[PDB]
Amino acid sequence: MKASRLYTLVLVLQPQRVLLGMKKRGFGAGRWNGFGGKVQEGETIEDGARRELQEESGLTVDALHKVGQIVFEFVGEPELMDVHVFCTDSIQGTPVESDEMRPCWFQLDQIPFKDMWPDDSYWFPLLLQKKKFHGYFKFQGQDTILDYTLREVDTV
Numbered sequence: 001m002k003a004s005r006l007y008t009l010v011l012v013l014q015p016q017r018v019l020l021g022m023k024k025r026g027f028g029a030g031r032w033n034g035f036g037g038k039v040q041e042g043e044t045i046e047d048g049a050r051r052e053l054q055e056e057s058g059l060t061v062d063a064l065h066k067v068g069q070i071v072f073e074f075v076g077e078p079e080l081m082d083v084h085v086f087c088t089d090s091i092q093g094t095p096v097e098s099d100e101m102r103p104c105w106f107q108l109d110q111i112p113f114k115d116m117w118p119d120d121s122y123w124f125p126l127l128l129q130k131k132k133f134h135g136y137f138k139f140q141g142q143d144t145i146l147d148y149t150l151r152e153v154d155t156v
């Protein structure tokens with residue numbers, strides 16, 4: 001089994017809208033996404049999620065809610081991406097464009113799935129229903145899923 005590297009993903013989800021960012025470069029460029037990145041040495045996963053939210057969007061939050069975990073495998077890449085997914089409904093400040101991301105709010109009847117990673121179609125609806133989930137997706141490149149598993153869980 002491949003080694004895995006820790007990543008975070010943070011969704012600011014309010015009652016009628018969600019904050020996404022347009023990835024300007026790097027992994028997932030050109031796709032809307034939550035904010036996040038590699039967990040660093042010495043921080044908890046939740047603290048790494050808070051840090052990435054602040055670095056990529058300018059927003060601070062004191063606390064996050066863990067809602068899911070998704071493991072990504074890419075054909076031809078040796079490491080799995082172990083993505084820990086967090087939400088919050090309570091933000092301090094305004095989103096700001098970073099080098100990584102251009103922020104944009106979307107209404108919850110206008111989730112831009114066509115410009116999001118294909119796997120988000122499966123797990124994002126669970127997040128919106130306040131369910132907790134574990135997922136795994138194997139990709140060939142950026143567009144093709146070869147295998148996946150998704151389960152609703154009571155405890156992440």
Ligand SMILES: Nc1nc2c([nH]c(=O)n2[C@H]2C[C@H](O)[C@@H](COP(=O)(O)OP(=O)(O)OP(=O)(O)O)O2)c(=O)[nH]1
Pocket residue numbers: 007008009010026027028033034035036037038072081083100117118119120
């Ligand atoms: N919604 C969604 N998010 C994903 C998928 N795959 C995936 O890695 N992510 C998230 C996890 C991270 O938030 C982000 C990947 O991390 P990143 O490459 O931006 O990490 P980073 O900010 O440390 O990278 P960098 O500045 O060094 O380039 O994308 C996916 O299929 N769907």
Ligand code: NA
Pocket residue numbers: 036037038052055056100
């Ligand atoms: Na980052």
Ligand code: NA
Pocket residue numbers: 035036037038056100
């Ligand atoms: Na990032």
Ligand code: NA
Pocket residue numbers: 113114115116117118121
């Ligand atoms: Na899509």
